Amino acid sequence: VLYQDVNCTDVSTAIHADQLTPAWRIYSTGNNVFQTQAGCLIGAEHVDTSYECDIPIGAGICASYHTVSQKSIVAYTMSLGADSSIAYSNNTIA
Amino acid sequence: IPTNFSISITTEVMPVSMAKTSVDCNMYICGDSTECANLLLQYGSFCTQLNRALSGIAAEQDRNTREVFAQVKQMYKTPTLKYFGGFNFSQILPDPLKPTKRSFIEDLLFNKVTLADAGFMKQYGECLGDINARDLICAQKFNGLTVLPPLLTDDMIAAYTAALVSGTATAGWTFGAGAALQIPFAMQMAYRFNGIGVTQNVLYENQKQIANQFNKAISQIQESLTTTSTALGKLQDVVNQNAQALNTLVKQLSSNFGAISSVLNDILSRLDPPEAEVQIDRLITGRLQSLQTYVTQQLIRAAEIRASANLAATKMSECVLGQSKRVDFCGKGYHLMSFPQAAPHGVVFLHVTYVPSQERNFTTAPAICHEGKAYFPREGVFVFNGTSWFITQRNFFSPQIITTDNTFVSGNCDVVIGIINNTVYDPLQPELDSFKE
Amino acid sequence: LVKQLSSNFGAISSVLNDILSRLDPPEAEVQIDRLITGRLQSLQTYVTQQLIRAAEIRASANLAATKMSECVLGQSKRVDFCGKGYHLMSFPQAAPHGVVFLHVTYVPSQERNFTTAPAICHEGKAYFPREGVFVFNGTSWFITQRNFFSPQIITTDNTFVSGNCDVVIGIINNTVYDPLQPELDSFKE
């Protein structure tokens, strides 16, 4: 799930106290990832790695479906691009 | 024919993105009243359509921003020298010692248009902040108007701009065709001149002068962006239009559309439900009309911003990723170079244009008949003549002698009008005369 | 647009022929006027959305027609307009309510490091390359082109005359070749 704009401190309380309106019967909460363009990423792990943006969430954070250890949804820094090794030289021609 | 050159640099501000707004019609109209929501549900799924339209606008803005900025495959590292062939590339690449990861020009751009109408942020709610500072102040309002942060952060935009500048300065211009071919900057400028029409002599023999002119133009751009007025008018006008639209929506929210009061939870407390529904229906209709007008205006503005973003992406792909011979497309005169710069919800290009210099009157010669055959000029198009003396090029003086390598054979002399009788030179005859005799 | 037709715009029922058999004509007037106004507003919103989508499709069609006229009907030197790199060809294909082009682009291949030479002063005059822009040199050896290797020897036909050698920074001393002198020395001498 991805709440539009929340603090990830009141949503958890409303879920644990049955105060949220879209309260599903088989819904739970295992982890919260508070960041810009919030939503707490309930059901996804915030991995410190970087992969190509598959599902654009917002604020530089995206989501995909990779294998942590198994297949699950993660969150990365959008991997803005692959690194290069092009160095300037005044006597090198390619 | 011009006798000198003048390396000028022009600026062009083009918006590529707008304010990603999100208005919850369930909170804007019928904030917390249950009977109000029950009456609103009778009018149909207008709120769902408006939310879908706003989400589509946000997705279109994100896609336009990505297509404009994210155009290269690899992220080329910014060089540490920043001084290639005499051209001082400072204040363009991110400084490795400055706290911010932007350049001086990018800092000047972000410190002159980011006012965002200071004083109107209290109207709508926004979940601003950053996860790095661990503050992340998440503010909300009763009107339901929210502003979603963009996908590409300012840091990623600055990184894309730095990668573009590195791929333009270093590796020449072949980085846009899906490759990476190393080449010095002086040879790149010589090839740009050759593509324009100017020979490499003006570049190599006057490299120091061109570098000094480029540095002076960079300094003039810095001065014009430091303390001036009426700068970055496009982005400022876009922000002002967005703020005015939000303010008009907020004012239309607190409008008494022929009812007892314009504020909710005030007519449900002093009136009876059968007598209050009549007043609720008028307010609901008025707010629905106002929100529909706002959504239509937002769609029109989003289409305009998408067109501007497509134009800016085309300009970038034509001027930064290569050398376009399009007249008055990149800059004022000859393009000859292009450097993009990051800007809030827009792109500011730095077209290093080529402008001629002081001129001089000369004499023309359509053709020259040496021994009965006319000799029309080669690639060097202008036959500069004191009195039928030499043959030169167009964009520069370049005094060069007339030989058989600069002219080709043609018909007689009575076919071209205005032909001037003169003599042609050929290095073969004196060489053979010196070798034999 | 279909689902909005069955919506109670402040009336008793969103289905015709039902409010006329249970209400009075004077009340049925307003009961029908409310539904008429609601349906007119919904249809106006639909027409506005259709106009916006039609303007977008018209812009896309103009862009596609420009791309076709620039890539299929000729050879455009536009950078990253037809395909990825150099255009070099274009083939259009029919598609439902759209056009699918086949840009046969030109992409470079594996590279190799070489040495540069801004100018070559043979006997006091610097020979700048005329056509072949890249002076491929093992150690000041040859002159080639940019988009391909094409190993070609440096001659006087691929270079022109210029000033002295103390004007260009980075000039490498080398020798130029002219086919006239060996031919003359072989024929006469």
CSV table of N, CA and C in Angstrom, one decimal, chain A residues 2-11 34-35 37-40, chain B residues 127 136 138 140:
chain,number,residue,atom,x,y,z
A,2,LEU,N,0.3,2.4,-0.4
A,2,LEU,CA,1.0,3.6,-0.4
A,2,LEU,C,0.0,4.8,-0.1
A,3,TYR,N,0.0,5.2,1.1
A,3,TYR,CA,-0.8,6.3,1.5
A,3,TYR,C,-0.3,7.6,0.9
A,4,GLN,N,-1.2,8.5,0.6
A,4,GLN,CA,-0.8,9.7,-0.2
A,4,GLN,C,0.2,10.6,0.6
A,5,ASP,N,-0.3,11.1,1.8
A,5,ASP,CA,0.5,12.0,2.6
A,5,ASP,C,0.2,11.7,4.1
A,6,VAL,N,1.1,11.0,4.8
A,6,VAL,CA,0.9,10.6,6.2
A,6,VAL,C,2.2,10.8,6.9
A,7,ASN,N,2.1,10.6,8.2
A,7,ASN,CA,3.3,10.7,9.1
A,7,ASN,C,3.8,9.3,9.5
A,8,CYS,N,3.1,8.3,9.1
A,8,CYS,CA,3.5,6.9,9.5
A,8,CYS,C,3.6,6.7,11.0
A,9,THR,N,2.9,7.5,11.8
A,9,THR,CA,2.8,7.4,13.2
A,9,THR,C,1.4,7.3,13.6
A,10,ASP,N,0.5,7.9,12.9
A,10,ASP,CA,-0.9,7.8,13.1
A,10,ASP,C,-1.6,6.6,12.4
A,11,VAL,N,-1.1,6.3,11.2
A,11,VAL,CA,-1.6,5.2,10.4
A,11,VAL,C,-1.4,3.8,11.1
A,34,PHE,N,9.4,5.5,6.4
A,34,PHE,CA,9.0,6.9,6.3
A,34,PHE,C,10.0,7.6,5.5
A,35,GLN,N,9.5,8.3,4.4
A,35,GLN,CA,10.3,9.1,3.6
A,35,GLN,C,9.5,10.1,2.8
A,37,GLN,N,7.3,11.8,0.0
A,37,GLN,CA,6.3,11.2,-0.8
A,37,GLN,C,5.9,9.9,0.0
A,38,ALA,N,5.4,10.1,1.2
A,38,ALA,CA,5.3,9.0,2.1
A,38,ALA,C,4.2,8.0,1.7
A,39,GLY,N,3.9,7.1,2.7
A,39,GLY,CA,3.0,5.9,2.4
A,39,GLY,C,3.5,4.7,3.2
A,40,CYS,N,4.7,4.9,3.9
A,40,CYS,CA,5.3,4.0,4.8
A,40,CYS,C,5.8,2.7,4.2
B,127,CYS,N,3.8,17.7,2.3
B,127,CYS,CA,4.6,16.8,3.2
B,127,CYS,C,6.1,17.1,2.8
B,136,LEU,N,11.4,15.9,8.0
B,136,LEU,CA,10.2,15.5,7.2
B,136,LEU,C,8.9,16.0,7.8
B,138,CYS,N,5.4,17.0,7.8
B,138,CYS,CA,4.3,16.6,7.0
B,138,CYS,C,3.1,17.4,7.4
B,140,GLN,N,-0.8,19.2,6.7
B,140,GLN,CA,-2.0,18.9,6.0
B,140,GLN,C,-3.0,20.1,6.3
